Short mmCIF file of N, CA and C and ligand atoms in Angstrom, two decimals:
data_model
loop_
_atom_site.label_atom_id
_atom_site.label_comp_id
_atom_site.label_asym_id
_atom_site.label_seq_id
_atom_site.Cartn_x
_atom_site.Cartn_y
_atom_site.Cartn_z
N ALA A 29 95.95 93.26 110.70
CA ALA A 29 96.78 94.26 111.36
C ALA A 29 97.10 95.41 110.41
N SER A 30 96.13 96.32 110.23
CA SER A 30 96.32 97.46 109.36
C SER A 30 95.78 98.71 110.04
N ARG A 31 96.39 99.85 109.72
CA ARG A 31 95.98 101.15 110.23
C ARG A 31 95.44 101.99 109.08
N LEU A 32 94.37 102.74 109.35
CA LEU A 32 93.75 103.56 108.32
C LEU A 32 94.46 104.90 108.18
N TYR A 33 94.78 105.27 106.94
CA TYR A 33 95.32 106.57 106.60
C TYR A 33 94.57 107.13 105.39
N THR A 34 94.70 108.44 105.20
CA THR A 34 94.13 109.12 104.04
C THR A 34 95.23 109.84 103.27
N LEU A 35 94.93 110.12 102.00
CA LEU A 35 95.80 110.92 101.15
C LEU A 35 94.91 111.68 100.18
N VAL A 36 95.09 113.00 100.08
CA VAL A 36 94.27 113.85 99.22
C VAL A 36 95.17 114.52 98.19
N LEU A 37 94.81 114.38 96.91
CA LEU A 37 95.49 115.06 95.81
C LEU A 37 94.55 116.11 95.24
N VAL A 38 94.96 117.37 95.31
CA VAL A 38 94.24 118.47 94.67
C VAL A 38 94.71 118.51 93.22
N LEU A 39 93.92 117.91 92.33
CA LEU A 39 94.31 117.67 90.94
C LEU A 39 93.39 118.46 90.03
N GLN A 40 93.94 119.47 89.38
CA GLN A 40 93.24 120.32 88.45
C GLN A 40 93.70 120.00 87.03
N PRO A 41 92.99 120.49 86.00
CA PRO A 41 93.27 120.01 84.64
C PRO A 41 94.72 120.16 84.20
N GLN A 42 95.44 121.19 84.66
CA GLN A 42 96.81 121.42 84.22
C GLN A 42 97.82 121.49 85.36
N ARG A 43 97.41 121.23 86.60
CA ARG A 43 98.35 121.33 87.71
C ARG A 43 97.85 120.48 88.88
N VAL A 44 98.79 120.09 89.75
CA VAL A 44 98.48 119.33 90.95
C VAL A 44 99.23 119.96 92.12
N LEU A 45 98.58 120.01 93.28
CA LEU A 45 99.19 120.55 94.48
C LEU A 45 99.85 119.42 95.27
N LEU A 46 101.13 119.59 95.59
CA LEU A 46 101.84 118.68 96.47
C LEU A 46 102.44 119.49 97.61
N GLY A 47 102.77 118.80 98.69
CA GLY A 47 103.39 119.45 99.84
C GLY A 47 104.66 118.73 100.23
N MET A 48 105.68 119.52 100.56
CA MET A 48 106.98 119.02 100.98
C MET A 48 106.93 118.87 102.51
N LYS A 49 106.93 117.64 103.00
CA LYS A 49 106.85 117.41 104.44
C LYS A 49 108.18 117.74 105.09
N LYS A 50 108.14 118.46 106.21
CA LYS A 50 109.37 118.96 106.81
C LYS A 50 109.94 118.05 107.89
N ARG A 51 109.10 117.26 108.56
CA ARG A 51 109.59 116.35 109.58
C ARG A 51 108.65 115.17 109.71
N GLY A 52 109.11 114.14 110.41
CA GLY A 52 108.30 112.97 110.64
C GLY A 52 108.34 111.99 109.48
N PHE A 53 107.34 111.10 109.47
CA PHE A 53 107.27 110.04 108.47
C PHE A 53 107.03 110.63 107.09
N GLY A 54 107.97 110.40 106.18
CA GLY A 54 107.87 110.95 104.84
C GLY A 54 108.53 112.29 104.65
N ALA A 55 109.27 112.79 105.65
CA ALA A 55 109.92 114.08 105.53
C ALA A 55 110.87 114.11 104.34
N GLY A 56 110.96 115.28 103.71
CA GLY A 56 111.85 115.47 102.57
C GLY A 56 111.30 115.02 101.24
N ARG A 57 110.02 114.64 101.18
CA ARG A 57 109.42 114.18 99.94
C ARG A 57 108.14 114.95 99.67
N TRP A 58 107.89 115.22 98.39
CA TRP A 58 106.61 115.78 97.97
C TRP A 58 105.54 114.70 98.05
N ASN A 59 104.33 115.11 98.43
CA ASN A 59 103.23 114.16 98.57
C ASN A 59 101.91 114.93 98.63
N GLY A 60 100.82 114.18 98.55
CA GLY A 60 99.52 114.72 98.88
C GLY A 60 99.43 114.95 100.38
N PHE A 61 98.23 115.31 100.82
CA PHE A 61 97.98 115.67 102.21
C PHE A 61 97.11 114.61 102.87
N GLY A 62 97.53 114.15 104.05
CA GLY A 62 96.76 113.11 104.71
C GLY A 62 97.38 112.73 106.03
N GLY A 63 96.86 111.64 106.59
CA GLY A 63 97.31 111.18 107.90
C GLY A 63 96.35 110.14 108.46
N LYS A 64 96.47 109.92 109.76
CA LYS A 64 95.70 108.87 110.42
C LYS A 64 94.24 109.27 110.56
N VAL A 65 93.36 108.29 110.44
CA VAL A 65 91.94 108.49 110.69
C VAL A 65 91.68 108.30 112.18
N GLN A 66 90.82 109.14 112.74
CA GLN A 66 90.61 109.17 114.17
C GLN A 66 89.38 108.36 114.56
N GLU A 67 89.24 108.13 115.86
CA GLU A 67 88.11 107.39 116.39
C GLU A 67 86.82 108.17 116.17
N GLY A 68 85.77 107.48 115.73
CA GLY A 68 84.48 108.10 115.52
C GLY A 68 84.36 108.94 114.28
N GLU A 69 85.34 108.88 113.39
CA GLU A 69 85.40 109.73 112.21
C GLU A 69 85.42 108.84 110.97
N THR A 70 84.62 109.19 109.97
CA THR A 70 84.67 108.43 108.73
C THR A 70 85.98 108.69 108.01
N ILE A 71 86.33 107.78 107.10
CA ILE A 71 87.56 107.95 106.33
C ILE A 71 87.53 109.26 105.55
N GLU A 72 86.40 109.56 104.90
CA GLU A 72 86.32 110.78 104.10
C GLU A 72 86.38 112.02 104.98
N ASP A 73 85.73 111.99 106.15
CA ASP A 73 85.85 113.12 107.07
C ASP A 73 87.29 113.30 107.53
N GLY A 74 88.00 112.20 107.76
CA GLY A 74 89.40 112.30 108.13
C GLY A 74 90.24 112.89 107.01
N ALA A 75 89.93 112.52 105.77
CA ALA A 75 90.65 113.06 104.62
C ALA A 75 90.45 114.56 104.50
N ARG A 76 89.20 115.01 104.65
CA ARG A 76 88.91 116.44 104.57
C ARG A 76 89.59 117.20 105.70
N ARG A 77 89.60 116.62 106.90
CA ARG A 77 90.24 117.26 108.04
C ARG A 77 91.74 117.38 107.84
N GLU A 78 92.38 116.33 107.31
CA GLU A 78 93.83 116.36 107.12
C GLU A 78 94.23 117.37 106.06
N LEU A 79 93.44 117.50 105.00
CA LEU A 79 93.75 118.51 103.99
C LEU A 79 93.77 119.90 104.62
N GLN A 80 92.79 120.20 105.47
CA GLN A 80 92.74 121.51 106.13
C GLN A 80 93.94 121.71 107.05
N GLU A 81 94.23 120.72 107.90
CA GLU A 81 95.35 120.84 108.84
C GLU A 81 96.67 121.08 108.13
N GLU A 82 96.92 120.36 107.04
CA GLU A 82 98.24 120.35 106.43
C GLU A 82 98.42 121.37 105.31
N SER A 83 97.33 121.80 104.66
CA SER A 83 97.41 122.74 103.55
C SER A 83 96.62 124.02 103.76
N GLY A 84 95.74 124.08 104.76
CA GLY A 84 94.87 125.22 104.95
C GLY A 84 93.70 125.30 104.00
N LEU A 85 93.50 124.28 103.16
CA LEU A 85 92.46 124.30 102.14
C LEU A 85 91.20 123.61 102.62
N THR A 86 90.06 124.14 102.19
CA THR A 86 88.76 123.55 102.45
C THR A 86 88.26 122.86 101.19
N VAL A 87 87.88 121.58 101.32
CA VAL A 87 87.28 120.82 100.24
C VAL A 87 85.88 120.38 100.67
N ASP A 88 84.95 120.37 99.72
CA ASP A 88 83.64 119.79 99.95
C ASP A 88 83.67 118.29 99.68
N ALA A 89 83.14 117.90 98.52
CA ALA A 89 83.11 116.50 98.14
C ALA A 89 84.50 116.04 97.71
N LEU A 90 84.93 114.93 98.27
CA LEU A 90 86.12 114.23 97.81
C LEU A 90 85.69 113.04 96.98
N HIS A 91 86.51 112.69 95.99
CA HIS A 91 86.25 111.54 95.14
C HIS A 91 87.24 110.43 95.45
N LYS A 92 86.72 109.24 95.75
CA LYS A 92 87.59 108.10 95.99
C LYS A 92 88.28 107.72 94.69
N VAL A 93 89.61 107.63 94.71
CA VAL A 93 90.35 107.22 93.53
C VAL A 93 91.21 105.99 93.75
N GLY A 94 91.56 105.64 94.97
CA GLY A 94 92.45 104.50 95.13
C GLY A 94 92.55 104.04 96.57
N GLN A 95 93.09 102.84 96.71
CA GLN A 95 93.49 102.29 98.00
C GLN A 95 94.84 101.63 97.80
N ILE A 96 95.82 102.00 98.62
CA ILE A 96 97.14 101.40 98.57
C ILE A 96 97.48 100.89 99.96
N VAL A 97 97.86 99.62 100.06
CA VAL A 97 98.33 99.04 101.31
C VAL A 97 99.84 98.98 101.26
N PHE A 98 100.49 99.54 102.28
CA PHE A 98 101.94 99.55 102.37
C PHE A 98 102.41 98.62 103.47
N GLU A 99 103.36 97.76 103.13
CA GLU A 99 104.07 96.95 104.10
C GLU A 99 105.50 97.44 104.17
N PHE A 100 105.98 97.70 105.39
CA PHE A 100 107.39 97.97 105.63
C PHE A 100 107.96 96.78 106.38
N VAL A 101 108.93 96.09 105.76
CA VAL A 101 109.43 94.86 106.35
C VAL A 101 110.02 95.15 107.72
N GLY A 102 109.73 94.27 108.67
CA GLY A 102 110.12 94.49 110.05
C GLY A 102 109.15 95.32 110.86
N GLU A 103 108.10 95.86 110.25
CA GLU A 103 107.08 96.61 110.97
C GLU A 103 105.77 95.86 110.95
N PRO A 104 105.12 95.66 112.10
CA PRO A 104 103.94 94.78 112.12
C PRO A 104 102.73 95.36 111.43
N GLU A 105 102.51 96.67 111.52
CA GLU A 105 101.26 97.25 111.07
C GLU A 105 101.34 97.64 109.60
N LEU A 106 100.37 97.17 108.82
CA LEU A 106 100.22 97.63 107.44
C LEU A 106 99.54 99.00 107.43
N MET A 107 99.93 99.83 106.47
CA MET A 107 99.33 101.16 106.32
C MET A 107 98.33 101.11 105.17
N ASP A 108 97.04 101.25 105.50
CA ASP A 108 95.95 101.13 104.55
C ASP A 108 95.54 102.54 104.14
N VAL A 109 96.07 103.01 103.01
CA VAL A 109 95.93 104.41 102.61
C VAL A 109 94.78 104.53 101.62
N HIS A 110 93.78 105.32 101.97
CA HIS A 110 92.66 105.62 101.09
C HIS A 110 92.93 106.95 100.39
N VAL A 111 93.01 106.91 99.06
CA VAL A 111 93.44 108.06 98.26
C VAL A 111 92.21 108.74 97.68
N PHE A 112 92.18 110.07 97.79
CA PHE A 112 91.07 110.88 97.31
C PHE A 112 91.60 111.98 96.40
N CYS A 113 90.76 112.43 95.47
CA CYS A 113 91.06 113.54 94.57
C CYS A 113 89.97 114.59 94.65
N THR A 114 90.35 115.84 94.41
CA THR A 114 89.41 116.94 94.25
C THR A 114 90.01 117.92 93.25
N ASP A 115 89.14 118.61 92.52
CA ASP A 115 89.57 119.70 91.66
C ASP A 115 89.06 121.06 92.13
N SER A 116 88.30 121.10 93.21
CA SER A 116 87.69 122.34 93.70
C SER A 116 88.01 122.50 95.17
N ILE A 117 88.73 123.57 95.51
CA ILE A 117 89.11 123.88 96.87
C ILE A 117 88.82 125.36 97.14
N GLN A 118 88.80 125.72 98.42
CA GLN A 118 88.73 127.11 98.84
C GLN A 118 89.91 127.41 99.74
N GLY A 119 90.38 128.65 99.67
CA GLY A 119 91.56 129.06 100.41
C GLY A 119 92.81 129.01 99.56
N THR A 120 93.87 129.58 100.11
CA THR A 120 95.19 129.60 99.50
C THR A 120 96.11 128.64 100.25
N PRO A 121 96.88 127.82 99.54
CA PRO A 121 97.83 126.93 100.24
C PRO A 121 98.75 127.74 101.14
N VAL A 122 98.93 127.27 102.37
CA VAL A 122 99.69 127.99 103.37
C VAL A 122 100.89 127.13 103.76
N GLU A 123 102.07 127.76 103.84
CA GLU A 123 103.25 127.07 104.34
C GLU A 123 103.29 127.18 105.85
N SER A 124 103.60 126.07 106.50
CA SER A 124 103.67 126.00 107.95
C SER A 124 105.00 125.36 108.35
N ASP A 125 105.20 125.23 109.67
CA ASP A 125 106.37 124.52 110.17
C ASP A 125 106.36 123.05 109.76
N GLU A 126 105.21 122.52 109.35
CA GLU A 126 105.11 121.11 109.02
C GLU A 126 105.12 120.83 107.53
N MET A 127 104.77 121.81 106.69
CA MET A 127 104.46 121.51 105.31
C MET A 127 104.70 122.72 104.42
N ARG A 128 105.29 122.47 103.25
CA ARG A 128 105.54 123.50 102.24
C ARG A 128 104.81 123.13 100.95
N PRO A 129 103.65 123.71 100.67
CA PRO A 129 102.90 123.33 99.47
C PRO A 129 103.38 124.08 98.24
N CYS A 130 103.21 123.43 97.09
CA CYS A 130 103.59 124.05 95.82
C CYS A 130 102.80 123.39 94.70
N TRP A 131 102.37 124.20 93.73
CA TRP A 131 101.68 123.70 92.55
C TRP A 131 102.69 123.20 91.53
N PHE A 132 102.35 122.09 90.87
CA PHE A 132 103.19 121.52 89.82
C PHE A 132 102.38 121.35 88.54
N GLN A 133 102.95 121.77 87.42
CA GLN A 133 102.40 121.38 86.13
C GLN A 133 102.50 119.87 85.96
N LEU A 134 101.51 119.29 85.27
CA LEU A 134 101.44 117.83 85.20
C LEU A 134 102.67 117.23 84.55
N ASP A 135 103.33 117.98 83.66
CA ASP A 135 104.56 117.53 83.02
C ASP A 135 105.78 117.63 83.92
N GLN A 136 105.66 118.25 85.09
CA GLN A 136 106.81 118.50 85.95
C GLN A 136 106.62 117.91 87.35
N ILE A 137 105.81 116.86 87.46
CA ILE A 137 105.64 116.22 88.76
C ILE A 137 106.97 115.66 89.23
N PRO A 138 107.42 115.97 90.45
CA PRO A 138 108.81 115.69 90.86
C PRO A 138 109.00 114.28 91.40
N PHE A 139 108.86 113.29 90.51
CA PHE A 139 108.85 111.89 90.93
C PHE A 139 110.14 111.49 91.65
N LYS A 140 111.27 112.09 91.28
CA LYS A 140 112.53 111.75 91.94
C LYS A 140 112.53 112.17 93.41
N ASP A 141 111.74 113.17 93.78
CA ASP A 141 111.64 113.66 95.15
C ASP A 141 110.32 113.24 95.81
N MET A 142 109.77 112.12 95.38
CA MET A 142 108.55 111.55 95.94
C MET A 142 108.82 110.11 96.35
N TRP A 143 107.90 109.54 97.13
CA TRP A 143 107.95 108.11 97.38
C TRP A 143 108.05 107.36 96.05
N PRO A 144 108.87 106.31 95.96
CA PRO A 144 109.08 105.65 94.67
C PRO A 144 107.84 104.98 94.09
N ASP A 145 106.91 104.51 94.93
CA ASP A 145 105.69 103.90 94.42
C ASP A 145 104.84 104.88 93.63
N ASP A 146 104.96 106.18 93.90
CA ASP A 146 104.13 107.17 93.22
C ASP A 146 104.30 107.11 91.72
N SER A 147 105.50 106.76 91.25
CA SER A 147 105.74 106.64 89.81
C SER A 147 104.84 105.60 89.16
N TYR A 148 104.33 104.65 89.94
CA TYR A 148 103.48 103.59 89.42
C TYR A 148 102.02 104.02 89.30
N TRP A 149 101.47 104.63 90.35
CA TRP A 149 100.03 104.88 90.38
C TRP A 149 99.65 106.33 90.08
N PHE A 150 100.55 107.29 90.28
CA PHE A 150 100.20 108.67 89.95
C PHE A 150 99.79 108.82 88.49
N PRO A 151 100.45 108.18 87.51
CA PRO A 151 99.96 108.27 86.12
C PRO A 151 98.54 107.77 85.91
N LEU A 152 98.12 106.75 86.66
CA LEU A 152 96.72 106.33 86.60
C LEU A 152 95.80 107.44 87.09
N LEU A 153 96.19 108.11 88.18
CA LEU A 153 95.39 109.23 88.69
C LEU A 153 95.26 110.33 87.65
N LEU A 154 96.34 110.61 86.91
CA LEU A 154 96.32 111.69 85.93
C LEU A 154 95.37 111.39 84.78
N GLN A 155 95.18 110.11 84.44
CA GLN A 155 94.24 109.71 83.40
C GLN A 155 92.89 109.30 83.97
N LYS A 156 92.60 109.68 85.22
CA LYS A 156 91.29 109.48 85.84
C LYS A 156 90.93 108.00 85.96
N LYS A 157 91.92 107.17 86.26
CA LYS A 157 91.69 105.77 86.55
C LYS A 157 91.70 105.55 88.06
N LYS A 158 90.99 104.52 88.51
CA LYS A 158 90.96 104.14 89.91
C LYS A 158 91.74 102.85 90.10
N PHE A 159 92.28 102.63 91.30
CA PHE A 159 93.22 101.53 91.45
C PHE A 159 93.22 100.97 92.87
N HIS A 160 93.70 99.73 92.96
CA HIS A 160 94.03 99.07 94.21
C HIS A 160 95.49 98.64 94.13
N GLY A 161 96.29 99.03 95.12
CA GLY A 161 97.71 98.75 95.09
C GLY A 161 98.20 98.16 96.40
N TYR A 162 99.33 97.47 96.30
CA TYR A 162 100.04 96.94 97.46
C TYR A 162 101.52 97.06 97.19
N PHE A 163 102.26 97.66 98.12
CA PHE A 163 103.69 97.86 97.95
C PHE A 163 104.42 97.38 99.19
N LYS A 164 105.39 96.50 98.99
CA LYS A 164 106.24 95.98 100.05
C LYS A 164 107.58 96.71 99.99
N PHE A 165 107.91 97.43 101.05
CA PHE A 165 109.11 98.25 101.13
C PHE A 165 110.14 97.61 102.04
N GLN A 166 111.41 97.79 101.69
CA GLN A 166 112.52 97.61 102.62
C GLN A 166 113.07 99.00 102.90
N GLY A 167 112.91 99.47 104.14
CA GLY A 167 113.24 100.85 104.40
C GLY A 167 112.27 101.76 103.66
N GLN A 168 112.75 102.95 103.30
CA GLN A 168 111.90 103.93 102.65
C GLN A 168 112.20 104.14 101.18
N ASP A 169 113.16 103.40 100.61
CA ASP A 169 113.58 103.64 99.23
C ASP A 169 113.43 102.44 98.30
N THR A 170 113.32 101.23 98.82
CA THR A 170 113.39 100.02 98.01
C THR A 170 112.03 99.33 97.99
N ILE A 171 111.45 99.20 96.80
CA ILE A 171 110.24 98.42 96.60
C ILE A 171 110.65 96.97 96.33
N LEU A 172 110.35 96.08 97.28
CA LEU A 172 110.71 94.67 97.12
C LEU A 172 109.76 93.96 96.16
N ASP A 173 108.46 94.19 96.32
CA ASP A 173 107.42 93.59 95.50
C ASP A 173 106.22 94.52 95.51
N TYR A 174 105.35 94.37 94.52
CA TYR A 174 104.15 95.19 94.49
C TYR A 174 103.09 94.53 93.62
N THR A 175 101.85 94.98 93.82
CA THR A 175 100.76 94.72 92.90
C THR A 175 100.00 96.02 92.70
N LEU A 176 99.46 96.21 91.50
CA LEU A 176 98.68 97.41 91.20
C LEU A 176 97.71 97.07 90.09
N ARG A 177 96.42 97.24 90.34
CA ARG A 177 95.42 96.92 89.33
C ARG A 177 94.36 98.01 89.29
N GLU A 178 93.90 98.32 88.09
CA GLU A 178 92.81 99.27 87.95
C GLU A 178 91.50 98.60 88.36
N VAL A 179 90.59 99.41 88.89
CA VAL A 179 89.30 98.94 89.37
C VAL A 179 88.23 99.94 88.96
N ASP A 180 86.99 99.47 88.94
CA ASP A 180 85.86 100.36 88.71
C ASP A 180 85.27 100.90 90.00
N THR A 181 85.40 100.17 91.11
CA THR A 181 84.90 100.61 92.41
C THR A 181 86.04 100.55 93.41
N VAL A 182 86.37 101.68 94.00
CA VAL A 182 87.47 101.73 94.97
C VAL A 182 87.06 101.00 96.24
O1 LIG B 1 99.07 109.19 105.66
C1 LIG B 1 99.53 109.26 104.34
C2 LIG B 1 100.43 108.07 104.13
C3 LIG B 1 100.64 107.03 105.00
S1 LIG B 1 101.74 105.90 104.35
C4 LIG B 1 101.89 106.89 102.94
C5 LIG B 1 102.76 106.49 101.85
C6 LIG B 1 103.68 105.47 101.99
C7 LIG B 1 104.50 105.12 100.88
N1 LIG B 1 104.45 105.70 99.68
C8 LIG B 1 103.52 106.68 99.58
N2 LIG B 1 103.25 107.46 98.43
C9 LIG B 1 102.23 108.36 98.76
C10 LIG B 1 101.85 108.18 100.08
C11 LIG B 1 102.65 107.13 100.62
N3 LIG B 1 101.16 107.98 102.94
#
């Protein structure tokens, strides 16, 4: 019982693009760009589509960097998030009614205003490591248990 989601991090040598979600699931937190994968669409195609919808950016090749499964206690469906990175995009980040994008220097990533699990795996992403993670949440703020391991093949 898991649902497929994507997450895209535009990660350049000295900065990363995050977006402040304005409403819905995850509102009020900085994050990468992503969402549900649709019928008849590959995971990577869904990731590329979500980046365009939410940031206005066009990406060619995405690189698989991680998979994180999220459990929210009391909710039946696990969220199976496939995480991708790119350093090459086209277009300018656009603010919309749904999303406010902003570039961050790697030393100033706003972990206090992000999902709490990001503090665990984002540093692996910054050092170009790949990972498999599982996080059990109570509500949206409390990590009850987790696992996180580096891998060679996502
Ligand atoms: O569709 C994207 C999506 C679904 S669930 C989720 C998520 C849940 C909990 N912590 C998180 N940190 C970064 C992303 C994330 N992102």
